[PDB]
């Protein structure tokens, strides 16, 4: 019922079919802005 980052889940490598959003956890020395700028995402087929 109820830092962190939100990463998309895509059906393929084209990143044109979003499935759902996943809330992971970040390490101590990393940065969410760098995570967003580097285009980190999750795929389903690769």
């Amino acid at each position: 019922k109820q830092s962190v980052v939100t990463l998309p889940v895509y059906l393929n490598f084209t990143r044109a079919d979003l499935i759902f959003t996943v809330d992971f956890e970040i390490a101590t020395k990393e940065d969410p802005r760098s995570f967003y700028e580097r285009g980190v995402a999750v795929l389903c087929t690769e």
């Binding site: 998309p8 979003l18 802005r33 760098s34 967003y36 700028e37 580097r38 285009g39 995402a41």
Partner: protein, 106 residues
């Protein structure tokens, strides 16, 4: 917006620059109008928030990181357009995708 903020003044303190106005308008109307995905909108917002503060025009501002090992593209300290274009012409010929914030292996 600069003409609205400055009533013909010669200089503005960087705190008085409409940073929030510029960021919101550019992320929602000009560049964000074409943006479809919420993640693309988030990336555009991150870029605008990182770039349109500069610690209020402070020196030694980090525009990007060219190489992960001891290399940064520091902000030029010029004030004039000629100084800025001279800094632009000084950029090295080799460009890695880490200039864009992308990984070098892209």
């Amino acid at each position: 917006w600069l003409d609205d903020t400055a009533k013909g003044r010669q200089n503005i303190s960087p705190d008085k620059i409409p940073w929030s106005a510029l960021k919101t308008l550019m992320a929602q109307s000009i560049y964000g109008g074409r943006v479809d995905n919420e993640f693309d909108q988030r990336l555009l917002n991150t870029f605008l928030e990182r770039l349109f503060t500069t610690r209020s025009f402070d020196s030694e501002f980090k525009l990007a990181c060219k190489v992960d090992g001891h290399k940064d593209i520091q902000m030029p300290d010029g004030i004039r357009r000629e100084e800025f274009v001279q800094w632009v012409e000084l950029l090295p010929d080799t460009q890695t995708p880490s200039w864009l914030g992308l990984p070098n292996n892209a």
